[model samples]
Target: QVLRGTVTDFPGFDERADAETLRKAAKGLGTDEESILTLLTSRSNAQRQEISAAFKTLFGRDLLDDLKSELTGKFEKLIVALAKPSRLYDAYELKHALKGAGTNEKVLTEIIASRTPEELRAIKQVYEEEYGSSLEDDVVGDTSGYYQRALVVLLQANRDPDAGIDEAQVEQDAQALFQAGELKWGTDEEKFITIFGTRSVSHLRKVFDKYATISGFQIEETIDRETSGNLEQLLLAVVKSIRSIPAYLAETLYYAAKGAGTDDHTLIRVAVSRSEIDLFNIRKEFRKNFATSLYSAIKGDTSGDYKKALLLLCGED
Candidate 1:
């Protein structure tokens, strides 16, 4: 089930040597920013973890702390984010998103909906361990109504994985959705929640197709009519992610760079988090859909070390 990824395990890797390279980078005058960037960007996150441990063993200081001390500005933000374990970084992002006024719904929606059941479970544990509060409680505190309901349902991390599909069951689900939304007077949101929250992605794709046949419109159009605000965004994410997660993220990245100023936070978060997972597919989709490489998108929108690290993660796309 492994997807195409941009970063892979480095060939002929030695954690000690990698750590030493980092040490030497930071040892001399002004720090070897080039070496640090290239080295970390080239390695997978698991390898980076080994390097973190090795750095501590050989040098008696945290690699992340050292980088933080040496780097500055947006470059530092991207680097430090890259240095943390994936789950821990997610916990940090979740906490940051939930704590502030207005809340970062985009971050919340992206992380919560995209992660697998197992990944979400670990993120929940890390969130509690790192932030001293339950993720459920935080999400509840920050959001409300049907949006919160769907968020909590997905957060439960109990979605059905791909297995054998039954056409009858798919038809039944499509009919249920049709009865719940288009045919109903107002809307029955719980019906949408139960179906979308628990079904397999493959099943959902079929249901969307059948739903269009039954309802005389696309499932996205149905969602557009029946929901608003956070719930709308979340339900749409669920649908898009089911269709092709890479394409969904590619669109997100495009919007992050499409307008006036770049959304630096989204750019850094998506690039860092997806680097070792489906970024290769994401880069491909970014090129196929947007008619330009993600590499060029970052180049057009950003500059300096931050842009370099992002392009490196984009990996020759």
Candidate 2:
């Protein structure tokens, strides 16, 4: 059922052990940052849920409320993100992206593009339950143009993950990319939108290979040459995610903290979002593509419990 995941399960998992760790670290006035990091980042998602439930029985107070009172900033966000069932965490990310005056289309793009159909279904349910609003309606209203169109279709979550790749289809879609943009007088946004939205990644990868055969430029290069703004980022992100989500997310971490000011939310989002899924691969990619490693980048850019939490999820050097 899953094409991508970290393929992991916990060993010797104990709810009482997690409850005890939290009882010690979460109760004190100043939280034990290392203890907290050790507990939070080590469990599988299901194990984390078990731990949180027992946390309530042990203390007779909501562990979530406890966390809120103690933690702050991006550290708080990471903790809350980790504690939730994965779908709810994704729902929260989507809500935040559309909240403010300027929409963080980047977050929206990443979440929407990277998710599997089952994941998206869960996200939609949580989004509606928590927000009392339809994800489709919000996305439709908040975004515009072909970007909006492509995203709305993805919200349908009907992409055929099991569909076998078709060589003929790949040939046609490849040349479709050229006709839609590079070889055309003007870009056909609908053409690009339809292909990416409807085709499965398994099929899309083949399409991209055929695309290079058809056009001198890679599909991404054609995209860059023709498109601009959020549309460009969205499509490019989809391309990278289809090829390798770890590499795509690794670059996200690099860009988030690379220059002077850090995009703390982005760094937190990508790290925590992928930590259980494929952050090990992200660490490898970060080391290879960038001169410095992800661990060092987090160390240099951040301070306090925020940095500690992130580094722990990053795994060993």
Candidate 3:
């Protein structure tokens, strides 16, 4: 049921000893940044949770609070994120996506489009419980038109799971998408919305291949012509995710680092969130696509403890 995760349950894990190390690491005038990096980055999230509990039992203070006070900047943020439960971290990321003056549509799209239905359900529940507002309501309030409609469908978290594959349905869906876009004038948005939003990943992969065969264009090509703005981004993101999430995220990491000013937020988010999930595959894809290692990318762009932590999460080049 799992792919590859870079960080696993650390060998010789002793929560009490690790907690004590952290307690002492931050106690001195100069925090032991190197020890903090080695300790937290190597442990799995579940193990980190145990260390946090052990730290509380030993020190009578929250490990995260101590880390926050001691560490600073992106390094601190990355460590704190590693400490929280994966789903709760996602919920927090989504909440911030919908916050403030302008919507962080990139974050909103990336999280909402990529998470599994079951994962999204947990995030939606946590969002409601933590923020006292439904995740859907906040998303709807921030986005509009076909984009909002399509997002609401995704937010329902009810996409059908892969049940083997059905050739007939794949052909039908491919044709339906063609007719809705390239085959006709204007565009019938509902068919694209319904087909893209509900189909299982396996089914959609079939549909996409069938689509290219029949439509004489990749689905992305038609999507480019038929839609605009946020709607287009969301739909394309969904397609990319269905095709291969690791490859998609590899591209994300590439873009985050390739530009003039590094997007440290995106870089940290991708590194922290995926480190324990499928960052192994992500690094593989990153090297394949960019012809350079993700570790090298981070090393080239960043300095100090931040780069060190990211490289550790990135694992082997």
List the global CA lDDT of all models.
Answer: 0.85, 0.80, 0.86
Error of 1 at 236 (Å): 0.5
Number of the top candidate by TM-score?
Answer: 3
Q: For candidate 2, lDDT tens digit of each residue in 1-317?
A: 22233424568888988877888887647587578776777776668778889988887877778887787878888787777776578888888877775488888888888886778889988898999999988899899888888888788788767468778888988888889988889999788878887888899887888788789788888899899989998889888887887878888878888668699888877876766777778787677788787878888889987887777777776
Candidate 2 collision pairs? none
Clashes of each: 0, 0, 0
lDDT of 1 by residue, 1-317 (tens): 45777888889999999989989989857687888998898888888999999988888999998889988888888888888897677768888888757579889898887776778988898889877899999999988888888999999888898887899989998978888888888888888888888988888889998888888888888899888878888988888887888888888899888879688898888888888788888888787788998877888888888888888878887
Tell me each candidate's TM-score: 0.92, 0.89, 0.94
Each prediction's RMSD over C-alphas, in Å, is 2.0, 2.6, 1.8
lDDT of 2: 0.80
Residue 13 lDDT (model 2): 86
- lDDT by residue (tens digit), candidate 3, 138-238: 98898888888988999998888887898999998998999998889888889998998998989998899989989889998789999987889888889
| Regions of model 3 farther than 4 Å from truth | none
lDDT for 232 (candidate 1) = 83
Residue pairs with backbone overlap in model 1? none
TM-score of 1: 0.92
Off-target runs (Cα >4 Å) in candidate 1 are 27-29, 100-102
